[PDB]
Amino acid sequence: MNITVETTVAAPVGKVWRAYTTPEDIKQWNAASDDWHTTAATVDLREGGAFSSRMEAKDGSMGFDFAGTYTKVVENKRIEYAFGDRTAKVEFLEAPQGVTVRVSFVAETEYPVEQQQQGWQAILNNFKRHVESHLEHH
Template structure:
């Protein structure tokens, strides 16, 4: 399992909304500078599906990151299963005006675990910057 985390200086409501609403996800869900999140569909409910279309800025490559939510506890926990059956979870621990967000997930076999950890930490770091600056 890979775990990434960060502490965000904002309310739990704001962090939750920015993590879950498509118009916000498109702004921070970037692991590598020459990629972007082109489309987001997100049915945040148990059994609901999510799909992020990730694309290179030059249009040469894209892929869909998708799965199903297996557990959703409002303002607290999101668990999911990806289409390749890997699982993950995101926890939100709030303390006053800060939120510690922690994501744990099963890595793929195609890429090194250290690279996947770096990519996901970059995404969490981008979320922090986006939330704290908007």
């Protein structure tokens, strides 16, 4: 199954796209802890480029290992990449009222379809909150 999620934000396409693939920006809404756990996020912004972001737990709070590599990028607007044994493609749409960000990915059988849908949507929602924190828009 293919799972699709979408989030619309009131921000310039260039700023959203650049923030979408900045690791320091990613840390703003993910990959951080108060109880002193080791997190790091990296993004390699180039077609064919490869990157990995990881979270670690000192006490056992949270953590994970995510890796991905880019296969195609178009007009800073259409991007396809692979992550582990699954793949995803993100599209950026310019709207009169705002910019819409759409992410489609292949379902992982180990996790419920609904849980994955909400998870990836939450990521875009975190991107929305990132915009809101970095732009009056709220």
